[PDB]
Coordinates of C-alpha atoms in Angstrom, one line a residue:
Chain A
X1 CA 12.9 13.0 1.2
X2 CA 9.7 14.8 2.4
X3 CA 8.3 13.6 4.5
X4 CA 11.3 12.6 6.5
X5 CA 11.4 9.1 7.9
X6 CA 13.8 6.3 8.9
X7 CA 12.2 3.8 6.8
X8 CA 10.4 3.9 3.0
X9 CA 8.3 1.7 1.2
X10 CA 9.2 1.6 -2.5
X11 CA 6.3 0.6 -4.4
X12 CA 6.8 -0.5 -8.2
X13 CA 4.0 -0.7 -10.7
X14 CA 5.6 -2.8 -13.4
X15 CA 5.4 -5.6 -16.3
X16 CA 4.6 -8.8 -14.9
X17 CA 7.2 -10.5 -17.1
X18 CA 9.8 -8.3 -15.6
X19 CA 9.2 -9.7 -11.7
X20 CA 12.3 -12.1 -12.0
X21 CA 14.7 -9.6 -13.7
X22 CA 13.6 -6.9 -11.0
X23 CA 14.2 -9.6 -8.1
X24 CA 17.6 -11.0 -9.5
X25 CA 18.9 -7.1 -9.3
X26 CA 17.6 -6.4 -5.9
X27 CA 19.5 -9.5 -4.8
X28 CA 22.7 -8.0 -6.1
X29 CA 22.4 -5.1 -3.6
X30 CA 21.5 -7.0 -0.8
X31 CA 17.7 -6.8 -1.0
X32 CA 16.8 -10.5 -0.4
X33 CA 13.0 -10.2 -0.4
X34 CA 10.3 -8.5 -2.3
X35 CA 6.5 -8.9 -2.0
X36 CA 4.4 -9.0 -5.1
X37 CA 0.8 -8.7 -6.1
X38 CA -1.4 -8.4 -9.3
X39 CA -2.8 -5.4 -10.4
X40 CA -4.8 -3.8 -13.3
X41 CA -4.3 -0.5 -15.2
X42 CA -6.8 1.0 -17.6
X43 CA -13.8 -4.8 -19.4
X44 CA -10.4 -3.9 -21.1
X45 CA -7.2 -3.9 -18.7
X46 CA -3.6 -3.7 -18.6
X47 CA -1.9 -6.4 -16.5
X48 CA 0.6 -5.0 -14.0
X49 CA 2.5 -6.4 -10.9
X50 CA 2.8 -4.1 -7.7
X51 CA 6.5 -4.7 -6.0
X52 CA 6.9 -3.8 -2.6
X53 CA 10.0 -3.5 -0.6
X54 CA 10.6 -1.5 2.7
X55 CA 14.0 -0.1 3.2
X56 CA 16.3 2.4 5.2
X57 CA 16.2 5.9 3.8
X58 CA 20.0 5.6 2.7
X59 CA 19.1 2.6 0.2
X60 CA 16.0 4.2 -1.4
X61 CA 17.9 5.5 -4.5
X62 CA 19.8 2.4 -5.1
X63 CA 16.3 0.4 -4.8
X64 CA 14.8 3.0 -7.5
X65 CA 17.6 2.6 -9.8
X66 CA 17.8 -1.3 -9.5
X67 CA 14.0 -1.6 -9.9
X68 CA 14.5 0.6 -13.0
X69 CA 17.5 -1.7 -14.3
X70 CA 15.2 -4.7 -14.0
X71 CA 11.9 -3.4 -15.2
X72 CA 12.6 -0.8 -18.2
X73 CA 12.0 -1.9 -21.7
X74 CA 12.0 1.4 -23.3
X75 CA 8.3 0.8 -24.6
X76 CA 5.4 2.9 -23.3
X77 CA 3.8 1.1 -20.6
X78 CA 7.0 0.4 -18.0
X79 CA 5.2 1.8 -15.3
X80 CA 5.7 3.8 -12.2
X81 CA 7.6 3.8 -8.7
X82 CA 6.3 5.4 -5.6
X83 CA 8.2 6.1 -2.6
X84 CA 6.1 6.3 0.6
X85 CA 7.4 7.2 4.2
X86 CA 7.2 3.9 6.8
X87 CA 7.2 4.9 10.4
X88 CA 7.8 1.6 11.7
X89 CA 8.8 -2.0 10.8
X90 CA 8.4 -4.8 12.9
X91 CA 9.1 -8.9 12.5
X92 CA 6.2 -10.9 13.6
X93 CA 8.1 -13.8 14.8
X94 CA 10.3 -11.8 17.3
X95 CA 8.5 -8.6 17.9
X96 CA 11.8 -6.8 16.7
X97 CA 11.2 -3.3 15.7
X98 CA 13.5 -0.9 13.3
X99 CA 16.8 -1.8 11.8
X100 CA 16.7 -5.3 13.6
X101 CA 13.3 -6.1 11.7
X102 CA 13.9 -4.7 8.1
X103 CA 16.1 -7.3 6.5
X104 CA 14.3 -10.3 5.2
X105 CA 15.2 -13.6 7.0
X106 CA 13.1 -16.3 5.1
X107 CA 14.7 -19.3 3.4
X108 CA 15.9 -18.9 0.0
Chain B
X1 CA -8.2 21.3 5.9
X2 CA -6.4 20.9 2.5
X3 CA -2.9 21.4 4.2
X4 CA -2.6 17.5 5.1
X5 CA -0.4 16.2 7.6
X6 CA 2.5 14.9 6.9
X7 CA 3.1 17.5 4.2
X8 CA 4.1 16.3 1.1
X9 CA 4.3 17.1 -3.0
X10 CA 2.3 13.9 -3.7
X11 CA -0.4 11.8 -2.2
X12 CA -1.7 8.4 -2.8
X13 CA -5.6 8.4 -2.7
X14 CA -6.5 4.7 -1.9
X15 CA -10.2 3.8 -2.3
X16 CA -11.6 0.6 -1.1
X17 CA -15.0 0.3 -3.1
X18 CA -17.7 -2.0 -4.5
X19 CA -16.3 -4.0 -7.3
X20 CA -19.1 -3.1 -9.7
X21 CA -18.6 0.8 -9.1
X22 CA -14.9 0.9 -10.6
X23 CA -15.7 1.5 -14.3
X24 CA -18.1 4.2 -13.0
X25 CA -15.2 5.8 -10.8
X26 CA -12.7 5.4 -13.8
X27 CA -15.0 7.4 -16.1
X28 CA -15.6 10.2 -13.5
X29 CA -12.1 10.3 -13.0
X30 CA -11.5 10.5 -16.6
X31 CA -14.0 13.6 -16.9
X32 CA -11.7 15.6 -14.7
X33 CA -8.6 14.6 -16.8
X34 CA -7.0 11.8 -14.4
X35 CA -5.7 8.7 -15.7
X36 CA -3.5 6.0 -14.4
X37 CA -5.7 4.6 -11.7
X38 CA -4.5 1.0 -10.6
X39 CA -7.0 -1.5 -9.4
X40 CA -6.8 -4.7 -7.4
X41 CA -9.1 -7.3 -5.6
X42 CA -9.3 -7.1 -2.0
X43 CA -11.7 -8.6 0.4
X44 CA -13.0 -7.7 3.9
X45 CA -15.1 -9.8 6.5
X46 CA -13.7 -18.3 5.2
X47 CA -16.6 -15.9 4.5
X48 CA -15.6 -12.5 2.9
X49 CA -17.0 -9.2 1.0
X50 CA -15.6 -8.7 -2.2
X51 CA -14.1 -5.0 -2.7
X52 CA -11.8 -3.4 -5.0
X53 CA -9.0 -1.4 -4.2
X54 CA -8.3 1.8 -6.6
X55 CA -5.1 3.6 -6.3
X56 CA -4.2 7.0 -7.6
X57 CA -1.1 9.2 -7.1
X58 CA -1.6 12.7 -7.6
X59 CA -0.4 16.1 -6.5
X60 CA -1.4 17.8 -3.2
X61 CA -3.7 20.3 -5.2
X62 CA -5.4 17.4 -6.9
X63 CA -6.6 15.6 -3.9
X64 CA -9.9 17.1 -3.1
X65 CA -11.1 16.7 -6.8
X66 CA -10.2 13.2 -6.7
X67 CA -11.8 12.3 -3.4
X68 CA -15.1 14.1 -4.5
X69 CA -14.9 12.3 -7.8
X70 CA -14.5 8.8 -6.3
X71 CA -17.3 9.5 -4.0
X72 CA -19.3 10.6 -6.9
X73 CA -18.6 7.3 -8.9
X74 CA -18.6 4.8 -5.9
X75 CA -21.7 5.7 -3.6
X76 CA -24.6 4.0 -3.7
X77 CA -26.0 5.2 -0.6
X78 CA -26.1 1.8 1.3
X79 CA -23.7 0.3 3.8
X80 CA -20.6 -0.9 2.4
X81 CA -19.7 1.7 0.0
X82 CA -16.3 1.7 1.2
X83 CA -13.7 4.2 2.5
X84 CA -10.9 6.4 1.1
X85 CA -7.4 6.7 2.4
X86 CA -5.1 9.8 1.7
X87 CA -1.3 8.8 2.2
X88 CA 1.8 10.9 1.7
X89 CA 4.1 9.9 -1.4
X90 CA 7.7 11.3 -1.1
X91 CA 8.4 10.7 -4.7
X92 CA 7.2 9.5 -8.1
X93 CA 9.4 7.8 -10.7
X94 CA 8.6 7.2 -14.4
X95 CA 10.1 3.6 -15.2
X96 CA 10.7 4.2 -19.0
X97 CA 12.5 7.7 -18.7
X98 CA 13.6 8.1 -15.3
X99 CA 11.6 11.3 -14.9
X100 CA 11.0 12.2 -11.3
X101 CA 8.4 14.3 -9.4
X102 CA 6.0 16.3 -11.5
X103 CA 7.2 15.2 -14.8
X104 CA 6.5 11.5 -13.8
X105 CA 2.9 12.0 -12.5
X106 CA 1.0 11.7 -15.7
Chain C
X1 CA 8.4 5.4 21.1
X2 CA 4.8 6.1 20.4
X3 CA 5.6 9.5 18.6
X4 CA 6.0 8.1 15.3
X5 CA 7.8 10.0 12.4
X6 CA 6.2 11.1 10.1
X7 CA 3.5 12.4 12.8
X8 CA 0.1 11.8 11.6
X9 CA -3.5 11.7 12.8
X10 CA -3.8 8.2 11.2
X11 CA -1.8 5.3 10.4
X12 CA -2.3 2.4 8.1
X13 CA -0.9 -0.9 9.9
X14 CA -0.1 -3.2 7.1
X15 CA 0.9 -7.0 8.0
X16 CA 2.2 -9.5 5.5
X17 CA 1.4 -12.8 7.2
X18 CA 0.6 -16.4 6.7
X19 CA -2.5 -17.3 4.8
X20 CA -3.9 -19.6 7.3
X21 CA -3.7 -17.0 10.1
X22 CA -6.1 -14.5 8.8
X23 CA -9.1 -15.9 10.9
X24 CA -6.9 -15.7 14.1
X25 CA -5.7 -12.3 13.3
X26 CA -9.3 -11.0 12.4
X27 CA -10.7 -12.7 15.6
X28 CA -8.0 -11.0 17.8
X29 CA -8.6 -7.5 16.3
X30 CA -12.2 -8.1 16.9
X31 CA -11.6 -8.7 20.6
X32 CA -10.1 -5.1 21.2
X33 CA -12.9 -3.7 19.1
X34 CA -11.1 -3.2 15.7
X35 CA -13.1 -4.2 12.4
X36 CA -12.8 -3.2 8.8
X37 CA -9.8 -5.1 8.0
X38 CA -9.0 -5.5 4.3
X39 CA -7.1 -8.6 2.9
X40 CA -5.3 -9.3 -0.2
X41 CA -3.0 -12.3 -1.4
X42 CA 0.7 -11.2 -2.2
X43 CA 3.7 -13.4 -3.2
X44 CA 7.0 -13.5 -1.7
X45 CA 9.3 -14.0 -4.5
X46 CA 11.6 -12.8 -1.9
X47 CA 10.9 -21.7 -11.9
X48 CA 8.9 -18.9 -10.6
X49 CA 9.1 -20.0 -7.0
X50 CA 7.2 -17.9 -4.3
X51 CA 5.6 -17.9 -0.8
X52 CA 2.0 -17.3 -0.4
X53 CA 1.3 -14.7 2.1
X54 CA -1.8 -12.3 2.8
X55 CA -1.4 -8.7 3.3
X56 CA -3.9 -7.3 5.9
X57 CA -4.6 -3.6 6.1
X58 CA -6.1 -1.6 8.8
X59 CA -6.1 2.3 9.0
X60 CA -6.6 3.4 12.7
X61 CA -5.8 6.5 14.7
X62 CA -2.4 7.1 16.2
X63 CA -3.6 6.0 19.7
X64 CA -4.7 2.6 18.3
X65 CA -1.4 1.5 16.7
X66 CA 0.3 -0.2 19.6
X67 CA -2.6 -2.5 20.4
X68 CA -3.1 -3.3 16.8
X69 CA 0.6 -4.2 16.5
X70 CA 0.4 -6.3 19.6
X71 CA -2.6 -7.9 18.5
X72 CA -1.5 -8.8 14.9
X73 CA 1.5 -10.4 16.5
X74 CA -0.8 -12.4 18.8
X75 CA -2.9 -13.6 16.0
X76 CA 0.1 -14.2 13.2
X77 CA 3.1 -15.7 15.2
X78 CA 4.0 -19.4 15.2
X79 CA 7.7 -18.9 16.3
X80 CA 8.9 -20.4 13.0
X81 CA 10.8 -18.6 10.0
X82 CA 8.1 -17.2 7.9
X83 CA 5.8 -15.3 10.1
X84 CA 6.1 -12.1 8.1
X85 CA 6.4 -8.5 8.7
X86 CA 4.1 -5.3 10.0
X87 CA 4.6 -2.0 8.4
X88 CA 3.2 1.3 9.6
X89 CA 2.7 4.3 7.2
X90 CA 1.2 7.7 8.0
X91 CA -2.2 8.4 6.7
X92 CA -3.3 11.8 6.3
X93 CA -7.1 11.5 6.0
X94 CA -9.9 9.0 6.2
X95 CA -13.2 9.4 4.2
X96 CA -16.3 7.6 4.3
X97 CA -17.9 7.0 0.8
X98 CA -21.5 6.7 1.8
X99 CA -21.5 9.9 4.0
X100 CA -18.4 12.1 3.0
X101 CA -17.5 12.1 6.7
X102 CA -13.9 12.8 7.4
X103 CA -11.3 12.3 10.0
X104 CA -12.4 10.3 13.2
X105 CA -15.8 10.1 12.1
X106 CA -14.9 8.2 8.9
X107 CA -12.3 5.8 10.4

């Protein structure tokens, strides 16, 4: 990927009713945590949700594929996935940084 | 300089602007042929100022027209008009088809 | 290292933290002269059960990043599981809407 980076944010803008399917699919590949927020596409709007996950470079393709598995319906309006370089990941609780900081360690 | 660092094929143009200027920005962007803007409610400084984040991912060569157009739609002249951020995007994937890169952009 | 990869003039510091720590993080940043933090509500899905968090975003110069990280931790840390994470992403440029000022003038 260009830019090259140790970590990447995978940002998926998908249908709100596909949250659980994407989340469950990610869990199967060891991605235990996703961050979700409400967004609107074009007072007429289309409701979407942004799903954000930060992973190591070697996990990006698996994450993309897994999100598609959960989010795809075959109908126009399935959304888009963006990949952005992440220079650093820090765990607030411990100050751990990098690989020691990327995994989600919240309660299930 | 248009040669943004880091170099990337795509960039996210992220604008934090006044909530009431969103239709104006969207319309202005439509006038230059750009669609697919995503909008979300954010807040700046339990007292807050309501703002809207508008996000559009485009090719490197579209960035300057997008910046100019957002300003055109969002500027009022008063303090609090907001800011625009440009961030490198390594790839774009259309969920429906699996198309990647330029095919997936619009 | 402070020499972040990718190398960039600016970086977005993105903190996903406990909602009740907003005021402490904002105050702490103010104490080091940092203003212009933007916040939004997010849901940690990782019945439709979730954890409420707030995403705090600030775009700063490369040389402000370490102070910003440390200050956010100071404001947001409780020591208990669930304090959240900070992400750092390169930002190629900042533009002020009112003036059209770019680069450091805008940031």
